[PDB]
Amino acid sequence: TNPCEKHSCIAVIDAGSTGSRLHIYSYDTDDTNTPIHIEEIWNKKIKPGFASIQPNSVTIDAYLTMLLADAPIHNIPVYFYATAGMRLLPQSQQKKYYDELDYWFRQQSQWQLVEAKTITGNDEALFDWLAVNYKLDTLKSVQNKSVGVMDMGGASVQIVFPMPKNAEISKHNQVELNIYGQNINLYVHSFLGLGQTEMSHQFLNSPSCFANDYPLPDGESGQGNAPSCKEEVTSLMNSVHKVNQQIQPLLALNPVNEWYSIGGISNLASSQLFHFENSELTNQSLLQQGDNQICHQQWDILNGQYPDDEYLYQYCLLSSYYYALMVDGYGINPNQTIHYIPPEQNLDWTIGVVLHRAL
Amino acid sequence: NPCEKHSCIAVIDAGSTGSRLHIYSYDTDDTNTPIHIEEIWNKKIKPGFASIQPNSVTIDAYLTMLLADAPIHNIPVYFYATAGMRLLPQSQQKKYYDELDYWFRQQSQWQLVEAKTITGNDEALFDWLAVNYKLDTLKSVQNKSVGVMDMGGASVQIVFPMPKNAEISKHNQVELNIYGQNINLYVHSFLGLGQTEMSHQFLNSPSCFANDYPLPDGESGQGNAPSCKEEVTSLMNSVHKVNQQIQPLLALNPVNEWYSIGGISNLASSQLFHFENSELTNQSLLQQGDNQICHQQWDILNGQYPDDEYLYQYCLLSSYYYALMVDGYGINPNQTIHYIPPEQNLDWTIGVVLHRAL
Ligand SMILES: [Cl-]
Ligand SMILES: [Cl-]
Ligand SMILES: [Cl-]
Ligand SMILES: [Mg+2]
Ligand SMILES: [Mg+2]
C-alpha cells in the first residue's frame, strides 16, 4: 500500500550537526487546509552531519544516495532544512553545499526539492515547540497550563515557552502563531555553541569531566566529579553566554508548568547506566547518577562493559553539562520533573514544518 | 636530485584546518644533528584529516591528493596530527590510524616511521625549535629570551625559556641538548582556544562582526572590538584560566623577543591590516580591526575587498588575538610581536627534523 495515493505526503529532512534524518509524513487537512492525522511512514537516519563532509560531488552524491535511495516512495515534495552544524559555517561555505545539493536533485526525476536552506535557531525552536505540542495533542484547544520545550542538540540548544508580546525584547525572540483557530505567543531562543559537541571542545582537558583514568588529550588522567565538572560548564553558560541573565527573568515572569525535552538528553536518560521511570527525570537525579555511575568509575572497566555506547566516554561530562544548562543557566529547580520523549519515537522538530507552512 | 647529495625526510603537519607535507634535505654536524635544513617540496591540502569520514576510500583519496605528485620518494615519513585529532576520543582516532597504517604497509616508496597524534606540549616544543632554527639562535647561548606563540585552528601554544625547577609540573617543562647547548623550556597548549573552536562560541555576538553582517540567528552585526575582546576574554580567563596559569611564570621568566606563527601571520599580512617589518603590537592590531572591519558596513566592505575569504571574521580575530595575548598571557599591549611571513611556510615541522636526532 502507498498511503500517498490517498493522503498528502511530504518529505522533511532534519540536517543536524551530528547526522541527517529523513522523515516521510502522510497527513490530511481540516477546514483551513491545516494538517491533521500526521503520521510518519518512513524514517532513515545517517551519520555524520551534512555540514561536516567535504562539499564535492562525489561525497555529496554518496551521502544523499545513502539518505534517500531506499525510500519506498520518491515522487513527493522534499524540504531539506539544516540546523546549527551549517550555522557554524560562513554563508560562502554554506553556498557550496547548497549548490552541490541542488545539482544532485536535478540529476534525478522523482524527488521534487521544494527548498534547501539553513533555518535560524529561532525557526528551529518554533518547530521544536510545534512538534512536541502536536504529539501532546495540545494545539487544537486553548490550554490552561504552560508547556515549555528544550531541544538539546550537538551545536545549539533551544528553549521555547509561552510569553505575551514584550516591546523590550528583540522581535527575533518572539513568535505569534495562529494554528487551529487559536492565537499563541511564544518566546524562542537558541544558543549557538552550547550544543554538546561544541561545548565539549572547551573541557576535553578537565579531569573532573571524565571517568577515572580516561586518557585526556594532554596526557593527564580523568578523575571524575560531576559537581566540579558542572561548575566548569556553568562558567561557559553564564560568564560567556549569559544564559542566566537572558532566560531566568523571563521564566520568573512567565512560569512553565510542564517541561518536555528532545535531542541528546533522551538518549542519555535511556541508556543502561541511568535509571528513570515514566520517561521523566530530575536534574538532581541526573547529576547524582552520572556522578556515581560514570564519573567515579574506572574508564577501562566501563568501556569494556558498555561496548555499544559510542558516546559513553562523554557521559560524566553530559550529566554535568545538562545540569549546568537547565539549573544554573535556565534556573529550573533541581527537583523539577523534566519529561523526555523516548528516542524510538523519532520525534524531532520536523513535524513543525508539516504544520507551519500552512499557518 | 637533492637527495642524492643530502639526507632527506618527509614530515606532515596534519593540522585542524588541513595537512601540509614538507620534504627537507639536510646535512649533519659532528653529532649527527641536522644543519643546512632546506625545504625541497611543500604541498598543502584542505580540510583537516580529523574532519573527514574515516573510511578506506576517503582516506586513500586524501593521502593520494597529499603525496602522489611528490618529486621524491624512498625516504622516511612522519605523519604527526595535532589539535584537530586531539578533539576525538582514542577509539575514533584509532580508526584513522589503522587505515593510514594499511595504506603505508601497501605501497613500497614511502617509509613510514611514525603516524600519531602528538601532544600539545610536543607541538609547542617543535614550535620553539622551528622558529629558533630559522632565527639562527640555536648555535650559541643566547643573551636573551625568545618566546614563541603558535595560533592554530583548534589549539594555541606558548613556549619560552624557564630554568629547571622543583616547583612547576614536570609535565610542562622540557629539557633538551642541541648543538652542544642545554636549553630548558616551559611549554603549554590550550585545546579549544584555537580560532575555529573559539569562534563557535561568538557567532551571534553583534560586537564581533561588521555592521549589518548577517548573524546566523537573524540579528545584524554591530562591530565594537573592545566589546568583542571582553566577550572573548571571559572564555580565556573565566573558563580556561589562561591568566592564572601563564602570567605568574612570565613574570618570573620574562621574554625579550616574541615570535608568532599560525593564523596571526595570515591576518597581519592581509590587505586590510598595515604593519611594518613583519611585526605588530596588540594595541595597533585591535585599533585597526575596530576601524577597518568592526565599524564598517558589511556589504560595502565586502565589495571593496573581494579577494579575502576570511575577511568577515577579521573583527572577531583582531579582538580574539588581543584577548589571548594581553588579557590571557599578560603581554603588554605595546609590546612588539614579530610574525613570520606566511610565504616562508614555517610551521613546527622543522622541530621534528631536529628533535629526532637529539
Ligand atoms: Cl592537549
Ligand atoms: Cl568527508
Ligand atoms: Cl542561530
Ligand atoms: Mg537537532
Ligand atoms: Mg598548526
Residue type, A13: I
- Shortest CB distance from B201 goes to which of A91, A92, A193? A193
- Among candidate residues B158, B127, B161, the one with its CA nearest the CA of residue B141: B161
- Give me ligand 1 centre to Cα B264, in Å: 20
Q: Which residues in chain B are closer than 8 Å to A97, comparing Cβ atoms?
A: none
Claim to verify: residue B70 and residue B197 sit in the same structural domain: no
Strand segments (E) across chain B: 7-14, 19-28, 34-45, 75-81, 110-117, 146-151, 155-161, 173-178, 181-191, 257-262, 279-280, 337-339
> Is B3 annotated as belonging to a binding site?
yes
Q: What is the CATH number of the domain that holds B331?
A: 3.30.420.150
Distance, CA of A310 to CA of A180 (rounded, Å): 42
B268, B276 Cβ separation under 8 angstroms? no
**3-state per-residue secondary structure call for B26-38:** EEECCCCCEEEEE
Q: Can you read off the three cell numbers belonging to residue B47?
A: 580540510
A290, A320 Cβ separation under 8 angstroms? yes
Q: What is the CATH number of the domain that holds B92?
A: 3.30.420.40
> Is A272 annotated as belonging to a binding site?
yes
- Shortest CB distance from A92 goes to which of B231, B238, B309? B309
Distance, CA of A280 to CA of A283 (rounded, Å): 10
Q: Can you read off the three cell numbers belonging to residue A118?
A: 539553513
Sheet holding A337-340, edge to edge: A174-179, A182-192, A156-162, A147-152, A258-263, A337-340, A280-282
Claim to verify: residue B112 and residue B233 sit in the same structural domain: no
Claim to verify: residue B254 and residue B356 sit in the same structural domain: no
Range of the domain at B75: 1-118+347-358
- Give me ligand 3 centre to Cα B30, in Å: 61
Claim to verify: residue A176 and residue A320 sit in the same structural domain: yes
A100, A135 Cβ separation under 8 angstroms? no
Claim to verify: residue A245 and residue A192 sit in the same structural domain: yes
Q: Output Rg (C-alpha) for chain A, integer angstroms.
A: 21
What total of structural domains would you count in chain B? 2
Claim to verify: residue B148 and residue B271 sit in the same structural domain: yes
Claim to verify: residue A91 and residue A164 sit in the same structural domain: no
Question: What was the resolution (in A) of this experimentally determined structure?
Answer: 1.6
Contact (CB<8Å) A202/B235: yes
Contacts of A293 (CB under 8 A, 6+ apart): A273, A274, A315
Distance, CA of B5 to CA of B1 (rounded, Å): 8
Claim to verify: residue B177 and residue B304 sit in the same structural domain: yes
- Among candidate residues A158, A153, A149, A208, the one with its CA nearest the CA of residue A184: A149
- The technique by which this structure was obtained is X-ray
CA distances from B92 to A195, A311, A314, B112, B174 (A): 20, 11, 13, 21, 29
Cis peptide before A77 (omega within 30 of 0): no
Cis peptide before B47 (omega within 30 of 0): yes
Claim to verify: residue B272 and residue B334 sit in the same structural domain: yes
Claim to verify: residue A114 and residue A248 sit in the same structural domain: no
Claim to verify: residue A239 and residue A352 sit in the same structural domain: no
Distance, CA of B194 to CA of B83 (rounded, Å): 9
B110, B43 Cβ separation under 8 angstroms? no
Pairing of strands A337-340, A280-282: antiparallel
Claim to verify: residue B254 and residue B241 sit in the same structural domain: yes
Pairing of strands B173-178, B155-161: unpaired
